[PDB]
Design an enzyme around this catalytic site. Structure first.
Site, PDB file in Angstrom:
ATOM      1  N   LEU F  41      -6.333 -12.317  -1.088  1.00 52.03           N
ATOM      2  CA  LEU F  41      -6.106 -10.882  -1.008  1.00 52.03           C
ATOM      3  C   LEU F  41      -4.632 -10.585  -1.264  1.00 52.03           C
ATOM      4  CD1 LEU F  41      -8.296  -9.916   2.102  1.00 52.03           C
ATOM      5  CD2 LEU F  41      -8.930  -9.891  -0.315  1.00 52.03           C
ATOM      6  N   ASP F  42      -4.390  -9.491  -1.997  1.00 54.00           N
ATOM      7  CA  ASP F  42      -3.054  -9.037  -2.352  1.00 54.00           C
ATOM      8  C   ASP F  42      -2.427  -8.285  -1.178  1.00 54.00           C
ATOM      9  OD1 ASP F  42      -5.292  -7.435  -3.829  1.00 54.00           O
ATOM     10  OD2 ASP F  42      -3.686  -5.944  -3.624  1.00 54.00           O
ATOM     11  N   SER F  43      -1.122  -8.011  -1.306  1.00 54.44           N
ATOM     12  CA  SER F  43      -0.311  -7.366  -0.283  1.00 54.44           C
ATOM     13  C   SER F  43      -0.760  -5.923  -0.055  1.00 54.44           C
ATOM     14  CB  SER F  43       1.158  -7.450  -0.621  1.00 54.44           C
ATOM     15  OG  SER F  43       1.412  -6.934  -1.927  1.00 54.44           O
TER      16      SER F  43
END
Ligand SMILES: *P(=O)(O)OCC(C)(C)[C@@H](O)C(=O)NCCC(=O)NCCS
Ligand SMILES: [Mg+2]
Lengths: 129, 217, 98, 69, 115, 87
Positions: F41-43
């Site tokens: 998962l991205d920021s």
């Protein structure tokens, strides 16, 4: 009384696929409220547009001027202008390309405005190549 | 002492009473809305209510380029370049929809008419919409901007080089040759200056206007 | 010089190369003839000068926001040929290429 | 390189926080619109153009030119 | 006042308007009983070798006092149905369109500036 | 008011929202996982998860600490500060 609260209720009653309401400042001299909604079909757009105008006529004062449904012949875009409100009824694919939401929230900072470059007159008024 | 141009009538056969009636009406309007002293060179910001919108307020800033008309119907055109597009609006002073008139910069140009700005470079017609007003000291003569504007190529809206226009605010040297100068000079009319029956002496008229103004106050 | 066929390489490209060579050579010569202020490497500038001096230019009207502007569009094909004709003639002067 | 790597985040966070206090506009659409913008247009670019996007989003946050209600 | 054979500046985001061409777009026809066309008057253009409907948004000829006058004759391209061809209008647009009779809401919506 | 609450119950409701999320599926979802690495998962993605916790418990999450709200055993420990369960 016909108001913004009445408008959003009517659209929800008619099962508008999407509802967006943006309150533009009086600095931009157009409207108090800009409303964009999405419809499933052309027929659905017509149904929603005609119903709100019918409801408006019932609730409006005698001094209040009559409104015109615009873009009846168009299969993708319908718009009704009231005194304080503008309603845009458009198909999802039409809404995506026009992105009216972005334009009114960001008047001069819109993405599509950035790609537009102002025309330049060549110096000394002499063309090259 | 500065008198607004519209107060001074153009010569004609009009009954003086008509002017008296129009003047009193003008003076009532002035009581409601302050109309500041401004010249053609001056930069103005006009605040107006627009009937098309639901009582929304519109500000327009620009350089005045023409003051014309007399009486209640008196107008002024002010010009500005907005995002590449040159726009002129002609504002009626005594229009009740005019909310406020502000003089951002008070100045006179060399010429009484600045219509040649249409054919001048856009830079001279472009002004910042959000510029802060500059205040003049109470006791000082109104400054004159001795600015000569550079021009676009020869085909113009009017033949400004012609002596009838009597333009003193264009670098004619840059954009025209001596041949073109002498061609223009063929339309000189030197006698016209010394025709002393064409002169309109607005001395007694202005005095009577001033009497009526001070009476109104 | 025009010894070889001109089908290989176009006219507009002739002016660029000739300008480069003449830059190395007596550049004071051609500038005086065409009335150009100073010798430049830009092919566009020199082609404008010859067009102006010949008097062969066309005014075109471009619509802008401050109003229509009568911009000048030079006859570059005509100017290029004249430049080559001048070079071939003794009017330009005596300049060796190689 | 945006002004800061946390600026973009704090910008995204605040916009999402605003999305909850929406009354008229569909909440799901508001979240989807921000999601599709902050990703597709605002993921892979240059440092010079990154700051521009942030300022754009900022003018949207304050919403002096218009707010979604 | 826009008549037949009037060269016209397209103030639109549309590809058709902004793309380079040898000749400027020219008015084929004015959709009014008198040939004269003003602000809010639909016209037909010859643009890029095709016939296309357009709407006038400001012109050089003076009008009523408080109404703005533009240095260039400005049009916005519209399809036969009535929707705009281009997405955005950068050039300022007069507010007099709103009250005028016709389909002006689309154009005002896509406009960014008003004078 | 004050409903019955336990640390075990906290875990259950935390994993409840995670399985509901589109990007992450229960198949690869675990009590011990990394959002940045394990779940990929991205920021920006992580912000949405934080907001799910924001509304659910109704206590404000400052932006200063919101960066370090990762690795879901930390999330449950962070929210364990409010109504502490010794267990
Ligand atoms: P996250 O750290 O996993 O995502 C990375 C990032 C998108 C936040 C960022 O470091 C990046 O790669 N670019 C900066 C954001 C951008 O592209 N434009 C700024 C829009 S406000
Ligand atoms: Mg004329």
């Amino acid at each position: 009384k016909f108001d913004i609260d009445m408008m959003v209720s009517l659209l929800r009653q008619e099962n508008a696929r999407d509802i967006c309401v943006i309150q533009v400042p009086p600095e931009m001299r157009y409207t108090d409220y800009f409303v964009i909604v999405s419809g499933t079909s052309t027929r659905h757009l017509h149904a929603m547009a005609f119903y709100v105008v019918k409801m408006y006529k019932h609730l409006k004062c005698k001094r209040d001027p009559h409104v015109k449904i615009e873009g009846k012949d168009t299969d993708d875009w319908l718009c009704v202008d009231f005194g304080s409100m503008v309603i845009h009824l458009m198909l999802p694919e039409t809404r995506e390309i026009y992105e009216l939401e972005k334009l009114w929230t960001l008047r001069s900072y819109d993405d599509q405005l950035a790609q537009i470059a102002p025309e330049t007159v060549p110096e000394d008024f002499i063309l090259g190549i | 002492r500065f008198l607004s141009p519209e107060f001074i009538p153009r010569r004609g056969r009009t009954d003086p009473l008509k002017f008296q009636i129009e003047r009193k009406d003008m003076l009532e309007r002035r009581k409601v809305l302050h109309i500041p002293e401004f010249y053609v060179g001056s930069i103005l910001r006009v605040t107006t209510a627009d009937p098309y919108a639901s009582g929304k307020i519109s500000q327009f800033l620009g350089i005045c380029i023409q003051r014309s008309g007399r009486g209640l119907g008196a107008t002024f055109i002010l010009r500005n370049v907005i995002e590449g597009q040159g726009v002129e609006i002609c504002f009626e002073l005594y229009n009740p929809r005019v909310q406020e008139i502000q003089v951002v910069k008070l100045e006179k140009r060399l010429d009484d008419s600045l219509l040649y700005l249409r054919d001048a470079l856009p830079e001279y017609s472009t002004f910042d919409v959000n510029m802060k007003p500059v205040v003049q000291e109470p006791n000082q003569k109104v400054p004159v901007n001795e600015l000569k504007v550079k021009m676009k190529p020869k085909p113009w809206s009017k033949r400004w080089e012609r002596p009838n226009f009597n333009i003193k605010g264009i670098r004619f040297d840059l954009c025209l040759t001596e041949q073109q100068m002498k061609e223009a000079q063929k339309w000189n009319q030197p006698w016209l200056e010394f025709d002393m029956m064409r002169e309109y002496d607005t001395s007694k008229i202005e005095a009577a206007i001033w009497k009526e103004i001070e009476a109104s106050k | 010089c025009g010894t070889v066929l001109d089908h290989l390489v176009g006219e507009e490209t002739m002016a660029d190369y000739l300008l480069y060579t003449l830059n190395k050579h007596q550049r004071f010569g051609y500038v005086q003839h065409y009335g150009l202020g100073s010798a430049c490497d830009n092919v566009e500038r020199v082609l404008k000068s010859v067009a102006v001096k010949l008097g062969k230019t066309q005014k075109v009207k471009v619509l802008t926001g401050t109003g229509n502007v009568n911009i000048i569009q030079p006859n570059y094909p005509a100017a290029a040929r004249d430049f080559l004709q001048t070079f071939r003639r003794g009017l330009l002067g005596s300049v060796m290429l190689d | 390189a945006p002004w800061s790597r946390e600026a973009v985040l704090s910008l995204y966070r605040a916009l999402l926080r605003q999305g909850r206090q929406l009354r008229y506009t569909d909440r799901d659409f508001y979240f989807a619109s921000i999601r599709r913008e902050f990703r597709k247009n605002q993921k892979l670019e240059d440092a010079e153009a990154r700051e521009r996007q942030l300022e754009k989003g900022l003018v949207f946050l304050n919403g002096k030119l218009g707010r979604i209600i | 006042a826009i008549q037949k054979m009037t060269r016209v500046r397209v103030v639109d985001n549309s590809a058709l308007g902004n793309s380079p061409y040898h000749r400027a777009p020219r008015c084929i026809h004015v959709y009014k009983k008198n040939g004269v066309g003003k602000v809010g008057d639909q016209i037909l253009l010859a643009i890029k070798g095709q016939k296309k409907k357009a709407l006038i948004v400001g012109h050089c000829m003076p009008g009523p006092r408080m109404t703005p006058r533009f240095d260039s004759n400005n049009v916005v391209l519209i399809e036969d149905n009535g929707n705009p061809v281009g997405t955005r209008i950068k050039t300022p647009i007069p507010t007099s369109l709103r009250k005028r009779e016709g389909e002006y809401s689309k154009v005002l919506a896509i406009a960014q500036n008003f004078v | 008011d004050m409903p019955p609450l336990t640390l075990e119950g906290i875990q259950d409701r935390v994993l409840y929202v995670l399985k509901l999320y589109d990007k992450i599926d229960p198949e690869k979802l675990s009590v011990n996982s990394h959002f940045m690495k394990d779940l990929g998962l991205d920021s920006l993605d992580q912000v949405e998860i934080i907001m799910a916790m924001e509304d659910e418990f109704g206590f404000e999450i400052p932006d200063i600490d919101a960066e370090k709200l990762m690795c879901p055993q930390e999330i449950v420990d962070y929210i364990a500060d409010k109504k502490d369960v010794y267990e």
